[PDB]
Amino acid sequence: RQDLSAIARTLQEWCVGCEVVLSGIEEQVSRANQHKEQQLGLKQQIESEVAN
Amino acid sequence: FSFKKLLDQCENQELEAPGGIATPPVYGQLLALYLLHNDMNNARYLWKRIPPAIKSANSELGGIWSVGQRIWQRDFPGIYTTINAHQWSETVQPIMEALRDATRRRAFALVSQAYTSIIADDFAAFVGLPVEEAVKGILEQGWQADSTTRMVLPRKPEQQLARLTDYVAFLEN
Amino acid sequence: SALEQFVNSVRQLSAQGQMTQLCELINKSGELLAKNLSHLDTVLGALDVQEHSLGVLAVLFVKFSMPSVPDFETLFSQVQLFISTCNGEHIRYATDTFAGLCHQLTNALVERKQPLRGIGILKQAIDKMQMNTNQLTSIHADLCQLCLLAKCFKPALPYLDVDMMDICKENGAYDAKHFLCYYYYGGMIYTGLKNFERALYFYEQAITTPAMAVSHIMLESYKKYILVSLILLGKVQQLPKYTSQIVGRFIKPLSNAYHELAQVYSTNNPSELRNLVNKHSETFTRDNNMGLVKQCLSSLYKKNIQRLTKTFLTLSLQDMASRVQLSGPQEAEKYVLHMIEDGEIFASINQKDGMVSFHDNPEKYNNPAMLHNIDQEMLKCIELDERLKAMDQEITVNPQF
Amino acid sequence: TRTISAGKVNLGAFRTYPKGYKPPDEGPSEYQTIPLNKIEDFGVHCKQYYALEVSYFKSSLDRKLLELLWNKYWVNTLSSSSLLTNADYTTGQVFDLSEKLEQSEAQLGRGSEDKLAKATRDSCKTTIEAIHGLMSQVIKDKLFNQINI
Amino acid sequence: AEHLIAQHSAIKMLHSRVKLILEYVKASEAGEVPFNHEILREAYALCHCLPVLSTDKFKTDFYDQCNDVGLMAYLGTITKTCNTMNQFVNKFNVLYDRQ
Amino acid sequence: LISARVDSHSKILYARDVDQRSTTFEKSLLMGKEFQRRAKAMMLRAAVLRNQIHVKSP
């Protein structure tokens, strides 16, 4: 109970780490779908050129 | 440390200011700064560009080119002789002291990985220091030392997910 | 009465939807343009000096007769401000005389004294001419010619580093030798800096270029190209199959003394090799590439020792001295140090006994060290895919089948 | 083996047609890497049948149990490691990939329609997995190793 | 999206658990929330028992794997470049070139 | 096929075997770097022919 903060702080760094990754996933997940919607949109522009 | 940002300024003033030929102290620093960042090819062709006018008048510039000879020749004791010779204060004397230090740790990081065993006298001259200071300098490091034969024995010396996700989405299309 | 009229015709076309009639004013000129155009260039800098300055400057440097009297400082400071921050925009659509502006400015400065300022000016001349990913214009060829002769290879490297696709023509404005010049000079540029890899690749692209006749650059690039591969490697680098037919038929046996060099090289005999260089000392020194031929003399000594790694793992200095032919344990210990210091071989020395130990071991691919290089080397292949994908979409819009 | 490496249920449900009557037109059929040793056998009899639209269901108890189960099953997700588990699929697919290129290389030369377009898709397919594997690995290195004492 | 969905809401469970323990840790020392020796004890272990492998050997092996996977990506990317190249080559060597 | 090095100090012959790992890595870098080098070349080669670049004779 002297160093109960020495136990608490080590726990916080892991709680921080949990957020570090959680948000880190959601960025990379939303970007991997965005790069798929980047190409799917850009490949519709390549095909519509042929209509001329 | 800051010699990098300052060398940039010298090289610019070569083509910037003059109709062709830069200032005589600007030539004195460009030659010595190339030696500081071990660029002997740049130091060689710089010397051959100087007009014979500034060459003859500015005789201290010859004292800096005499250093470059020894770096090309790799006569390491000759380097430290030629560094301790010409006092060109304000302009060059600050970069001459930094030159001797870069050549020293080059020859230490070299000798350490190039020799399992080596003569103390050679080792002394190759780094520049005398016999005692060399024998001491290494004993601090924890290098093995040998009496009688005089043989120093050198000891040999999101971020990640963002990168990955790209290589997926790239190959994925 | 006529020369003071069409100074207004340039300004009237300027700031309009079309300046395609200005493409006929700069081409006409009137041939015999009087001394009077010096005046007309002062009451001019309105929007940004227009393409008027280009029509004027083209005639000045193509006098080939008294540049502008010995006031060529007036003639340079004239071109100095035009090339700097005036630039314009439609320089792209008039490279007819703009390519020629940089050619004549060069040709003069070469034979004059030295272009050390002349290099600095020619840099910005490229930048609003080429648009995006660098485009191989004739100015690149000259920029090298200046900074080759003016012993200052530093500033041209920014452009030599990028392997620019797409040849900038525009009103023709490109010559069948200004391709050879860039990659010939460039090759030599890196040769002095001792970037032999890039040096070889440059000379290579010179030899490829198609040619119904034997041009004179192609013979020299080949001779030095021979020396580069014999220092970089220990052998002859073969060319592409698409090299010009005039090369293997004529140019190759014309540079015979350099193949004759490789003849002895593969035998690994420096003493014999040296006796060949002394015979054709003339032929080699005639081409001002002696020294580079002597760099091969040293690379053979370094090849000789490079082989030992594959056979022996512990060898004496004396043994090495006797086997490498250098004689004396110092000369042996010498190149050991240098090769190590440089990083051509993995070895070390035990002076106490007087032995050379061959580490023979670099890296185990077990750390970020590779991981980073793996990341970087890969990104350069993806960079390469990006280009090809754009280059594939370039073909999309053009005619049918 | 691929259910694992691909990281999701690799499954199929099919029904064959009569020997006499032959199928209608409407048929996209999605591409999967077929090893060349087998590509022939598939290729012949592949058009003789038709697949079935798969769907997955569950009971109330099953659904309620799996939710109560997940209290302690998240641990297995972050000590998963699909690498030494199915090591002998990915190491094998290379052998398959190498052959598919070998063909299309000589196809360009002298001499089934552009077998580099397949091989390109296979090189991605197999490597896409290999990369996805190292995603869950670094995810773990981030988590459990980097706390300090 | 179809891969990291697993980790996303799985680690959500990890964060849910790890945080709610630390909520008890702060409130126990703060007081009023019942102080307990035989629960807080296991927490002292739990948190220092972390540094889950920082052994010189382990990480070498971890990087050993990464480099292997990396090699596979380098070769895989060359393949895609090689196809995208030949996609461009044929379209150039027919429209531009006369076979 | 004598895959073995020479220790001429103590005059011994040791067998020298291959680091499998090193091998496949090593060459993959180098091959890829070769592929990159030719890609540079055939990009310029696409350009020179596109511009009809050649030195004529007569």
PDB file of C-alpha atoms in Angstrom, chain C residues 2 43 72 158 165 172 236 247 249 262 323 334 372 379 387 391:
ATOM      1  CA  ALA C   2      10.257  48.457 -89.495  1.00  0.00           C
ATOM      2  CA  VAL C  43      11.266  49.138 -72.368  1.00  0.00           C
ATOM      3  CA  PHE C  72      30.287  40.128 -72.695  1.00  0.00           C
ATOM      4  CA  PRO C 158      20.762  16.276 -58.647  1.00  0.00           C
ATOM      5  CA  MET C 165      12.238   9.004 -69.165  1.00  0.00           C
ATOM      6  CA  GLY C 172      12.235  19.143 -82.906  1.00  0.00           C
ATOM      7  CA  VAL C 236      33.689  -8.136 -69.380  1.00  0.00           C
ATOM      8  CA  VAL C 247      29.061  -1.447 -82.559  1.00  0.00           C
ATOM      9  CA  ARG C 249      30.867  -4.871 -86.470  1.00  0.00           C
ATOM     10  CA  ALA C 262      40.839  -8.003 -70.627  1.00  0.00           C
ATOM     11  CA  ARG C 323      51.023 -15.701 -53.883  1.00  0.00           C
ATOM     12  CA  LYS C 334      48.787  -3.003 -46.915  1.00  0.00           C
ATOM     13  CA  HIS C 372      14.625  -1.347 -43.264  1.00  0.00           C
ATOM     14  CA  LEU C 379       9.389   0.611 -52.087  1.00  0.00           C
ATOM     15  CA  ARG C 387       5.512   4.474 -63.211  1.00  0.00           C
ATOM     16  CA  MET C 391       2.764   4.537 -68.484  1.00  0.00           C
TER      17      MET C 391
END
